Design an enzyme around this catalytic site. Structure first.
Site, PDB file in Angstrom:
ATOM      1  N   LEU A  75     -19.717  12.100  -0.718  1.00 34.09           N
ATOM      2  CA  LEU A  75     -20.182  13.486  -0.612  1.00 34.09           C
ATOM      3  C   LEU A  75     -20.418  13.904   0.833  1.00 34.09           C
ATOM      4  CD1 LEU A  75     -22.726  13.312  -3.555  1.00 34.09           C
ATOM      5  CD2 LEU A  75     -20.622  14.679  -3.586  1.00 34.09           C
ATOM      6  N   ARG A  77     -21.511  12.016   5.120  1.00 30.94           N
ATOM      7  CA  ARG A  77     -22.126  10.975   5.924  1.00 30.94           C
ATOM      8  C   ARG A  77     -22.661  11.572   7.214  1.00 30.94           C
ATOM      9  NH1 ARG A  77     -18.317   6.567   8.573  1.00 30.94           N
ATOM     10  NH2 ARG A  77     -18.325   8.143  10.247  1.00 30.94           N
ATOM     11  N   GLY A  78     -23.885  11.194   7.568  1.00 33.14           N
ATOM     12  CA  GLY A  78     -24.460  11.552   8.855  1.00 33.14           C
ATOM     13  C   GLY A  78     -24.492  10.359   9.790  1.00 33.14           C
ATOM     14  N   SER A  79     -25.557  10.272  10.580  1.00 34.42           N
ATOM     15  CA  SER A  79     -25.723   9.214  11.572  1.00 34.42           C
ATOM     16  C   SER A  79     -26.426   7.971  11.024  1.00 34.42           C
ATOM     17  CB  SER A  79     -26.496   9.749  12.784  1.00 34.42           C
ATOM     18  OG  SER A  79     -25.660  10.526  13.625  1.00 34.42           O
ATOM     19  N   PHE A  80     -26.985   8.075   9.822  1.00 31.79           N
ATOM     20  CA  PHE A  80     -27.816   7.006   9.267  1.00 31.79           C
ATOM     21  C   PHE A  80     -27.493   6.649   7.814  1.00 31.79           C
ATOM     22  CE2 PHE A  80     -30.225   8.364  12.954  1.00 31.79           C
ATOM     23  CZ  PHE A  80     -30.745   7.180  13.456  1.00 31.79           C
ATOM     24  N   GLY A  81     -26.950   7.602   7.056  1.00 34.54           N
ATOM     25  CA  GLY A  81     -26.651   7.366   5.641  1.00 34.54           C
ATOM     26  C   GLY A  81     -25.307   7.850   5.119  1.00 34.54           C
ATOM     27  N   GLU A  82     -24.733   7.089   4.189  1.00 37.76           N
ATOM     28  CA  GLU A  82     -23.556   7.521   3.431  1.00 37.76           C
ATOM     29  C   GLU A  82     -24.001   7.974   2.045  1.00 37.76           C
ATOM     30  OE1 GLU A  82     -19.595   5.955   4.050  1.00 37.76           O
ATOM     31  OE2 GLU A  82     -20.458   4.039   4.714  1.00 37.76           O
ATOM     32  N   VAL A  83     -23.546   9.151   1.628  1.00 30.77           N
ATOM     33  CA  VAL A  83     -23.948   9.717   0.337  1.00 30.77           C
ATOM     34  C   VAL A  83     -22.775   9.766  -0.650  1.00 30.77           C
ATOM     35  CG1 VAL A  83     -24.969  11.715  -0.844  1.00 30.77           C
ATOM     36  CG2 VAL A  83     -25.824  11.025   1.402  1.00 30.77           C
ATOM     37  N   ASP A 184     -35.259  17.146  11.694  1.00 31.22           N
ATOM     38  CA  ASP A 184     -33.818  17.285  11.877  1.00 31.22           C
ATOM     39  C   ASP A 184     -33.253  18.465  11.079  1.00 31.22           C
ATOM     40  OD1 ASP A 184     -31.349  16.481  13.001  1.00 31.22           O
ATOM     41  OD2 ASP A 184     -30.879  15.247  11.248  1.00 31.22           O
TER      42      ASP A 184
HETATM   43  N1  LIG Z   1     -27.719  15.272  -2.679  1.00 33.46           N
HETATM   44  C1  LIG Z   1     -26.571  15.594  -2.025  1.00 33.46           C
HETATM   45  N2  LIG Z   1     -25.583  16.278  -2.656  1.00 33.46           N
HETATM   46  C2  LIG Z   1     -24.450  16.600  -2.007  1.00 33.46           C
HETATM   47  N3  LIG Z   1     -24.263  16.256  -0.720  1.00 33.46           N
HETATM   48  C3  LIG Z   1     -25.224  15.571  -0.040  1.00 33.46           C
HETATM   49  C4  LIG Z   1     -26.403  15.229  -0.693  1.00 33.46           C
HETATM   50  N4  LIG Z   1     -27.181  14.569   0.184  1.00 33.46           N
HETATM   51  C5  LIG Z   1     -26.506  14.498   1.350  1.00 33.46           C
HETATM   52  N5  LIG Z   1     -25.315  15.109   1.216  1.00 33.46           N
HETATM   53  C6  LIG Z   1     -24.288  15.234   2.281  1.00 33.46           C
HETATM   54  O1  LIG Z   1     -24.199  14.000   3.008  1.00 33.46           O
HETATM   55  C7  LIG Z   1     -24.533  14.192   4.384  1.00 33.46           C
HETATM   56  C8  LIG Z   1     -25.344  13.011   4.920  1.00 33.46           C
HETATM   57  O2  LIG Z   1     -26.617  12.907   4.282  1.00 33.46           O
HETATM   58  P1  LIG Z   1     -27.980  12.910   5.147  1.00 33.46           P
HETATM   59  O3  LIG Z   1     -29.125  12.778   4.171  1.00 33.46           O
HETATM   60  O4  LIG Z   1     -27.936  14.094   6.076  1.00 33.46           O
HETATM   61  O5  LIG Z   1     -27.876  11.528   5.989  1.00 33.46           O
HETATM   62  P2  LIG Z   1     -28.064  11.391   7.589  1.00 33.46           P
HETATM   63  O6  LIG Z   1     -27.494  12.614   8.260  1.00 33.46           O
HETATM   64  O7  LIG Z   1     -27.526  10.049   7.995  1.00 33.46           O
HETATM   65  O8  LIG Z   1     -29.668  11.401   7.811  1.00 33.46           O
HETATM   66  P3  LIG Z   1     -30.382  11.265   9.267  1.00 33.46           P
HETATM   67  O9  LIG Z   1     -29.312  11.386  10.335  1.00 33.46           O
HETATM   68  O10 LIG Z   1     -31.255  10.024   9.189  1.00 33.46           O
HETATM   69  S1  LIG Z   1     -31.634  12.708   9.634  1.00 33.46           S
HETATM   70  C9  LIG Z   1     -25.266  15.527   4.449  1.00 33.46           C
HETATM   71  O11 LIG Z   1     -25.012  16.206   5.678  1.00 33.46           O
HETATM   72  C10 LIG Z   1     -24.712  16.305   3.275  1.00 33.46           C
HETATM   73  O12 LIG Z   1     -23.567  17.055   3.688  1.00 33.46           O
HETATM   74 MG   LIG Z   2     -28.062  14.516   7.847  1.00 38.22          MG
END
Ligand SMILES: Nc1ncnc2c1ncn2[C@@H]1O[C@H](COP(=O)(O)OP(=O)(O)OP(O)(O)=S)[C@@H](O)[C@H]1O
Ligand SMILES: [Mg+2]
Length: 331
Positions: A75, A77-83, A184
């Protein structure tokens, strides 16, 4: 100690329970992902708590490819998690998983949204650990992120941008009253409904309790300068998100090359990036959200009021969901 005894009862098992249980347990994950590492036994540890009956542990276990599994295509991925998309094999319930390593996990990510009930903040279904692998379960939102939406559309019409800022500022206020900073806030971190009508705040990885910033372009001057910081950091970030929505590009970027810390501290606030064609109220709300001194800056509540009235000024939500591409401001 009462909490340290409660925590020990939770360890080594995944259980049905409530917010304070997960919160207390997550603290030990954050402290655990810091040790000098150990040779792994034959028993990879399985623990966490599930906050909804839609996700059920069987015999105090909840493991990937056994009790649940991910679906096709991530769905995001950011800098810390894959969703990823998620299905519990017993219940058949669909939701989202954020995969985080133990070594980067902060307990504040769960502290910031566990148990909290706001349509403007993603529901947390729970979190379970499989050794160094942390899984964060939450509501699946099918419309993608606001960051996805702005990349596809180029930029948003004035009414759309205001409409989402308003919703995000409603989430920010709910958090600030519970003494929690987001950390953030940006378009990538706000999720949208399928029909695009609802927005919800996600990604509390940079959250911090009141009494490290997430994104450079969205940093308030008082963070950059190393001064004292409160909830006003989120409102600055939200107006940086607003300009990103109106312009199709982050603040600062089309004018400077990194690092931007110096520029955010040295330059006036990026109010010159507000499109001249915007409504007086729209421009006014952004200007007072981008006040450099957090004391003279409006709260999330005050800003939410101002953007709602600005939405009324432009004539309410009229622009269609998705629609025609708007060419981003030229550098
Ligand atoms: N519940 C969700 N449903 C659909 N898409 C999601 C969902 N959660 C996250 N995403 C997508 O996946 C991306 C990454 O998830 P984040 O939770 O932003 O992880 P992250 O960016 O690594 O968190 P950080 O950097 O520690 S603040 C997001 O930018 C959304 O586009
Ligand atoms: Mg994010």
């Amino acid at each position: 100690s009462v909490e340290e005894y409660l925590v020990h009862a939770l360890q080594g098992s995944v259980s049905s329970g409530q917010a304070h249980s997960l919160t207390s347990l997550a603290k030990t994950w954050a402290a655990r992902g810091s040790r000098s590492r150990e040779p792994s036994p034959k028993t990879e540890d399985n623990e966490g708590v599930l906050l909804t009956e839609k996700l059920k542990p069987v015999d105090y276990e909840y493991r990937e490819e056994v009790h649940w599994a991910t679906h096709q295509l991530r769905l995001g991925r950011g800098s810390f998690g894959e969703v990823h998309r998620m299905e519990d094999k017993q219940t058949g319930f669909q939701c989202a998983v954020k995969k985080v390593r133990l070594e980067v996990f902060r307990a504040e990510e769960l502290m910031a949204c566990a148990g909290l009930t706001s349509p403007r903040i993603v529901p947390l279904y729970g979190a379970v650990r499989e050794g160094p692998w942390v899984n964060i379960f939450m509501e699946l939102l099918e419309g993608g992120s606001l960051g996805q939406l702005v990349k596809e559309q180029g930029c948003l019409p004035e009414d759309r941008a205001l409409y989402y800022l308003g919703q995000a500022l409603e989430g920010l206020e709910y958090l600030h009253s519970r003494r929690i900073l987001h950390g953030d806030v940006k378009a990538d971190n706000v999720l949208l409904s399928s029909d695009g009508s609802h927005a919800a705040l996600c990604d509390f990885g940079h959250a911090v309790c009141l009494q490290i910033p997430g994104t450079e372009t969205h940093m308030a001057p008082e963070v950059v300068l190393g001064r004292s910081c409160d909830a006003k950091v989120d409102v600055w970030s939200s107006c940086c998100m607003m300009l990103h929505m109106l312009n199709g590009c982050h603040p600062w970027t089309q004018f400077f090359r990194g690092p931007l810390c110096l520029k955010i501290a040295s330059e006036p606030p990026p109010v010159r990036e507000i499109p001249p064609s915007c409504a007086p109220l729209t421009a006014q709300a952004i200007q007072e959200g981008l006040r450099k001194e957090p004391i003279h800056r409006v709260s999330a509540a005050e800003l939410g009021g101002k953007v709602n009235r600005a939405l009324q000024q432009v004539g309410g939500l009229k622009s269609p969901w998705r629609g025609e591409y708007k060419e981003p401001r030229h550098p």
